Amino acid sequence: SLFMSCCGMAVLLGIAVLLSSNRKAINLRTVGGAFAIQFSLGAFILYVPWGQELLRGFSDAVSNVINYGNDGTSFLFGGLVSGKMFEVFGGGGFIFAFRVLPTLIFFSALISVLYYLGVMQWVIRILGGGLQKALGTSRAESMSAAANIFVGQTEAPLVVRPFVPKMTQSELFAVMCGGLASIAGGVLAGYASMGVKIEYLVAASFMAAPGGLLFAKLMMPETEKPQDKPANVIDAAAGGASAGLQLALNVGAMLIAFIGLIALINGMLGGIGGWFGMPELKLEMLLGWLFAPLAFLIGVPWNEATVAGEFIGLKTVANEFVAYSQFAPYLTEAAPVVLSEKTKAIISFALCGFANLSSIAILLGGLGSLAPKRRGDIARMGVKAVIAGTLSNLMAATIAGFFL
Amino acid sequence: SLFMSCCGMAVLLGIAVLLSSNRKAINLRTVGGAFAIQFSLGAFILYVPWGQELLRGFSDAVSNVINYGNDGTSFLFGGLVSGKMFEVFGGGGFIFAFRVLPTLIFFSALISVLYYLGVMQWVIRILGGGLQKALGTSRAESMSAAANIFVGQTEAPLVVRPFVPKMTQSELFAVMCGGLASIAGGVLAGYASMGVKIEYLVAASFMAAPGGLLFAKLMMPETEKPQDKPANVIDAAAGGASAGLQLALNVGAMLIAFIGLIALINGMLGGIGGWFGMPELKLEMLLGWLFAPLAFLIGVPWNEATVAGEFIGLKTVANEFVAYSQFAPYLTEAAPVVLSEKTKAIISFALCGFANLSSIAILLGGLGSLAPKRRGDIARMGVKAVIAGTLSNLMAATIAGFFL
Amino acid sequence: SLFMSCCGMAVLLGIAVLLSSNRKAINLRTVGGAFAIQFSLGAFILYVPWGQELLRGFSDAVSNVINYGNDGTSFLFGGLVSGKMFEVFGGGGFIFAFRVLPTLIFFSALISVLYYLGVMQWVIRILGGGLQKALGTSRAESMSAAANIFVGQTEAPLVVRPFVPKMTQSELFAVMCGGLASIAGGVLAGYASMGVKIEYLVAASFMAAPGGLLFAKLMMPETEKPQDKPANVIDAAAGGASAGLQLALNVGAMLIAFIGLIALINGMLGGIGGWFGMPELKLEMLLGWLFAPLAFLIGVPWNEATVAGEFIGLKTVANEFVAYSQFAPYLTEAAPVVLSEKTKAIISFALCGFANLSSIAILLGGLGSLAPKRRGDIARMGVKAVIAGTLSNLMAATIAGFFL
Numbered sequence A, B, C: 001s002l003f004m005s006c007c008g009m010a011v012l013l014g015i016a017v018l019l020s021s022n023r024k025a026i027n028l029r030t031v032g033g034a035f036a037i038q039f040s041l042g043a044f045i046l047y048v049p050w051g052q053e054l055l056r057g058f059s060d061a062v063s064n065v066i067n068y069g070n071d072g073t074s075f076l077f078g079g080l081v082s083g084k085m086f087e088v089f090g091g092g093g094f095i096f097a098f099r100v101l102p103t104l105i106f107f108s109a110l111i112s113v114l115y116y117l118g119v120m121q122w123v124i125r126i127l128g129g130g131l132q133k134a135l136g137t138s139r140a141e142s143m144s145a146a147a148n149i150f151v152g153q154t155e156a157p158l159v160v161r162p163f164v165p166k167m168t169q170s171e172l173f174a175v176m177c178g179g180l181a182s183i184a185g186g187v188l189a190g191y192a193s194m195g196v197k198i199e200y201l202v203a204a205s206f207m208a209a210p211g212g213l214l215f216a217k218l219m220m221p222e223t224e225k226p227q228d229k230p231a232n233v234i235d236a237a238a239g240g241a242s243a244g245l246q247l248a249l250n251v252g253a254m255l256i257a258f259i260g261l262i263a264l265i266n267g268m269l270g271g272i273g274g275w276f277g278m279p280e281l282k283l284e285m286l287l288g289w290l291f292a293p294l295a296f297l298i299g300v301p302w303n304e305a306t307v308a309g310e311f312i313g314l315k316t317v318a319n320e321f322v323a324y325s326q327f328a329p330y331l332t333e334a335a336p337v338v339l340s341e342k343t344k345a346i347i348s349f350a351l352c353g354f355a356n357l358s359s360i361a362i363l364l365g366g367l368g369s370l371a372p373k374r375r376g377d378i379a380r381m382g383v384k385a386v387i388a389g390t391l392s393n394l395m396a397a398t399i400a401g402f403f404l
């Protein structure tokens, strides 16, 4: 029952200790409180009545903002995003390129506005300040952790960019993990437009801050000693829209290629597998059969562990956007496999993160520009940071499945 | 009657004098002839028979070029830009992204071709030469003023780029105002594809050259002393298409975000206004109530001044493309408010310009690259240039409304 | 009969000799074997039974890869690329922007993957090694020739980029011609999606390697003495998708402008021609009337030489993508002119190449970046390389028409 979930938490913490740079350097106050906060935050917004009301209140607010931004894409693509599309094409009336992608543009512009008004910095300063006073973490890495709740892995350290080139290896690692254990506000609204429950996306985004610090200070404890704009609001909006556009193009081109490549892989595996009496062999079967124990370990039922492993595995070997693209049909009535409500939540939390190998290259570019002489350290701690970011997603998935 | 329009002209000229850098330095020949030319040009193509035939002859020529370029977008988007779209989606069959945006690509390529053939330079040299000999303005700023009739604010000073880094503060200001008081040929054909009368777009584009010089030499008189390529035509076309593409993407992403942001604003104003007994409070009401006297001053009837203020205000606080997007439905039979034919013209002229705060950043980039040590002067005279560019649009709107 | 084709080969070789930099420097072994290989390769895959089975086997493999990549574009554009489009819009249901363009993205990602796995380098090393040992050509130019079978003109010399800045004028010319006589794998799958027979595209791509070396060593013999990475596979795929996206945008914007410009040209020619009693005068008539002898010379029947000249001429004065766009309707049942099966093949081979004036600018950019001090030589030998690349397409078209 609930004993399998508690064991899963110990295992995830166990692997982090086994892969630690120095187990004797682990601060029990830091990693003890970090796990406590992430667990208490999960208990707050997923179990207790008041916490559930605040989460559903914030999610409904986000849901309204998404629909407001949909007035912009309704102007551009007109009837191609109307209700007539379902009367003509049926299920194929939902055009991903016109429905989901423009949401990245609007939200990137919105966050850019909220940054100009100082609204974003005000929230991060509170959340980041509460983390460093409770975990003992440094000022910079705590602000980057709180920033990563809303923005991306390369946009979050911008709030503390003059402290990046001279921060310790443990600090930089935590900064890398803070962005790998979380997502961005843009893609969040995109995933919500695909059918993913906003309550799960918002929850996982907030739990990514202490969870990101947790496995960062576990796999890389602090052994050294730390230290310590657009002209107008319309320019900020226009600048954010351009950034969202460039992101929307890249994501769209990525999904065309990757899904196409997977389709190519499945075609080859159908022939390769046939040589061993398995002509129905596909990528989903491999990822499902390989990630089934990991899914079963975090709280997914035995008869649903294989199906859940297909999505968790795809999120790891590729990225979460490709995984969510194959998990989205499982959130509708036309789902090939009817999953339990708890399982749908666990997959949603275990997929809510930029934790993948391809994000290392992005960290080498964006974060690497903030510290050009630190690109050697980033690439070196790259693989370790992905694991630490992965464990944070699995931990948040185990906690979520525990209180459900 | 016509007395309200003549008073409006005096007020607009009055504000320019009150905001002048030096009223005693104002050249009466320059600003006297500039206003005379803009007024005589308005009287020419909007009142006298022969001038109306030349304007309708040029507009029909432009209209044919647009339809010719529509063969390119008809190939790419096939039936999505066909007549079957209106039989299926009705009014929503008109897809802005496929109908209007590709026009920016084709026209940017066309102008790039006409530049290679020396056709563009030939016309600018004539118009620019006639301005400097009649107003006493310098060679460079007069050519940039004539160039801004056809191309954008950052593309126009390219004809005199070796004279930009060493031109006086009054010259640079006039160059800034020349591009703020006008638009580009690309977006012009785009606005014409939205229902905006081409006769008004072409007229306002030509009146922007003396009008841009008028309020520039009024708010910033000359107190100092002035001075004085693609391999083939296919490469020029291909280069212009790429420039139009990048512009089409930026405009499209801007409209998705801004309209979405306005929709978000209207949602918040509906709650904020409800606290003061005004739950129906929107952005249009504010902009309408605030710009109604300004609209009434330039020649808009009392019962239509508020509605006209919504578009003029939106053009100012944001940009003219967002304003035209909300004014375009008022040019069809499905218009919520039936405006008089004169009012439709006044709004069309008062919106035909890049006069906004966001264009300062564009001037800092494009025009600033032509003179990197002059970015300080551009940002300093930025706000003043927007006002001077705004007054030119209002003046052209007052003149247009006078002869109608 | 077959005598007209053999004469055509002599003429094409004749022009190359007449335009040679030094006819006495022509290596008879090099240009003798190069023509022999291209001719024997044509005889292999177009005449003999076994060679036809290997070509149809490779084409069917490519055809399957295209359909696999179509799963990615089916996810993004949903029902807009479904069969319901033909039930609603009929022939206009085929949306070029959603059907053909995304194929460039997927294939660019695929080739990027095959490069990471060393699969591409393995094939090029074999083909390139077999050319230098049979023709006596240098190591670098032979590898670039073999690479150009699969990738573009600026991507092919990347396999030998440290040898580019110090290669002779004859080597650099052959490198330029290798990319002008061939296409890329991305656009190849795009042309195949337009109805162009894959067997012809694959054949012409392979015949472009010895044909590119043939007319390069004919028009520019060697008179001097020659000499002698992504972190993971997912990063390689993501990087290739981004490159394909940027290419897809440029091609799409080019087709909108060029077709629109041609439509503008046809409008003007209709009036200009009317002054000389030819109101039906268009661009196709000119290109057809002018390239008819050239089409008749390579093996096109007398009554079909004019129609074929329209496509060959358009491929020359513009690019092959614009030509293929106007030739694609002639491959369907709704073709205005029913062409013979041999003629359809000849046009397909004569159009399969980047041989145009606009590709010189691309060579100055991409290839010029590999050798910044050699941009002077590239621009100088630019026009000659286009001709040499053109003759290679015509030669491959004559050979193809000979064995059919």
Ligand SMILES: CCCCCCCCCCO[C@@H]1O[C@H](CO)[C@@H](O[C@H]2O[C@H](CO)[C@@H](O)[C@H](O)[C@H]2O)[C@H](O)[C@H]1O
Pocket: A231, A232, A233, A234, B262, B317, B318, B357, B360, B379, B380, B382, B383
């Ligand atoms: C969709 C409808 C929403 C409606 C909302 C209305 C928004 C109004 C924006 C005005 O903001 C100002 O804009 C200036 C122009 O950029 C800035 O000056 C900046 O730029 C000036 C010059 O361009 C300088 O003089 C200043 O020093 C410099 O701060 C200035 O900071 C900023 O406060």
Ligand SMILES: CCCCCCCCCCO[C@@H]1O[C@H](CO)[C@@H](O[C@H]2O[C@H](CO)[C@@H](O)[C@H](O)[C@H]2O)[C@H](O)[C@H]1O
Pocket: B231, B232, B233, B234, C262, C317, C318, C357, C360, C379, C380, C382, C383
């Ligand atoms: C859609 C159908 C329309 C059909 C219209 C046909 C257009 C024909 C374009 C030819 O123009 C020439 O192209 C050369 C190639 O770029 C240029 O040479 C330039 O580049 C050469 C080398 O590449 C150099 O040798 C030259 O010095 C240099 O001027 C040259 O100036 C230019 O006159």
Ligand SMILES: CCCCCCCCCCO[C@@H]1O[C@H](CO)[C@@H](O[C@H]2O[C@H](CO)[C@@H](O)[C@H](O)[C@H]2O)[C@H](O)[C@H]1O
Pocket: A262, A317, A318, A357, A360, A379, A380, A382, A383, C231, C232, C233, C234
């Ligand atoms: C759609 C489903 C398809 C499923 C296919 C699964 C693909 C698996 C990719 C793994 O490849 C590895 O990834 C590392 C990460 O980038 C590379 O390390 C590189 O980067 C590391 C750090 O980031 C360094 O430690 C290494 O030295 C450096 O080689 C490494 O070379 C590479 O072998």
Ligand SMILES: Nc1ncnc2c1ncn2[C@@H]1O[C@H](CO)[C@@H](O)[C@H]1O
Pocket: A151, A152, A153, A154, A155, A184, A186, A187, A247, A319, A320, A321, A322, A353, A354, A355, A356, A358, A359, A362
């Ligand atoms: N805002 C962002 N910042 C950085 N990388 C991002 C962002 N959004 C998406 N990505 C990248 O795209 C992938 C798929 O969403 C992520 O795993 C990440 O690598």
Ligand SMILES: Nc1ncnc2c1ncn2[C@@H]1O[C@H](CO)[C@@H](O)[C@H]1O
Pocket: B151, B152, B153, B154, B155, B184, B186, B187, B247, B319, B320, B321, B322, B353, B354, B355, B356, B358, B359, B362
């Ligand atoms: N050709 C152009 N050059 C510069 N800015 C442009 C151009 N076209 C549009 N814009 C910008 O986009 C806004 C909306 O059209 C304008 O007010 C201006 O800021």
Ligand SMILES: Nc1ncnc2c1ncn2[C@@H]1O[C@H](CO)[C@@H](O)[C@H]1O
Pocket: C151, C152, C153, C154, C155, C184, C186, C187, C247, C319, C320, C321, C322, C353, C354, C355, C356, C358, C359, C362
């Ligand atoms: N892969 C490529 N590399 C370089 N140029 C290309 C490529 N694909 C297309 N082009 C350019 O676009 C034109 C039309 O396909 C070509 O003639 C060539 O100039």
Ligand code: NA
Pocket: A147, A148, A149, A150, A151, A152, A153, A156, A178, A179, A182, A183, A184
């Ligand atoms: Na983040």
Ligand code: NA
Pocket: B147, B148, B149, B150, B151, B152, B153, B156, B178, B179, B182, B183, B184
């Ligand atoms: Na202009």
Ligand code: NA
Pocket: C147, C148, C149, C150, C151, C152, C153, C156, C178, C179, C182, C183, C184
């Ligand atoms: Na090639």
